[PDB]
Each structure stands twice: as C-alpha cells, then as structure tokens.
Copies of this chain bind each other. A is one copy, B any other.
Amino acid sequence: MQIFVKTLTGKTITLEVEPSDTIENVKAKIQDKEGIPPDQQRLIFAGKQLEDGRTLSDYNIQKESTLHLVLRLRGG
C-alpha cells in the first residue's frame, strides 16, 4: 500500500509500504527519497507522534494514509 507523507513545506511523498512496517523503516524510505536523516524526522498522525519501534498498523494506518513528517534540529 502506498502511503502519503506531507511535510511542513506544502510537499507530500508517496511510499509503497505495508501495515506491518516499522516507523523507523518508513523514515529510512524518506531518507533515501528526500535525502534527510531519519534521526531528524518526526512522524505524527491523528495528533499522535509514532514511535520508531511501533509499526504502521499499531496506529491504525491504511493505504493512501496521510502522515505529518517534521524536521528536528539540535543546539549544543
């Protein structure tokens, strides 16, 4: 199933995944397409941040599901 991931710049990405894929695996897919590190990515859906150990089914996600990816930074 291809899911859509929208960022904070009016941009959306489609990734062919499955309901048994881990969030860390999804962040890695976006890292290969956009070229951004997974550690600097935050997947949020239905007003809930997804864990890297949990999968897409743990948060009730289906095909063509939209997600909110964010970019985290550091200071020190």
Q: How many residues of A contact B (CB 8 A)?
A: 4
Shortest CB-to-CB span from A19 to chain B, Å, is 14
Chain A positions 26-76 with a Cβ under 8 Å from a chain B Cβ: 46, 60, 75-76
Q: Across the interface, which residues of B come within 8 angstroms of A75, CB to CB?
A: 60
How many angstroms between the C-alpha atoms of A46 and B75 in the bound complex?
11
Find the B residue at minimum CB distance from A74: B60
Which of B46, B60, B76 is close to A46, meaning CB atoms less than 8 Å apart?
Answer: B76
Shortest CB-to-CB span from A52 to chain B, Å, is 18
Which A residues are within 8 Å of any B CB, using their own CB?
46, 60, 75-76
Minimum-distance CB pairs A-B, first 2: A60-B75, A46-B76
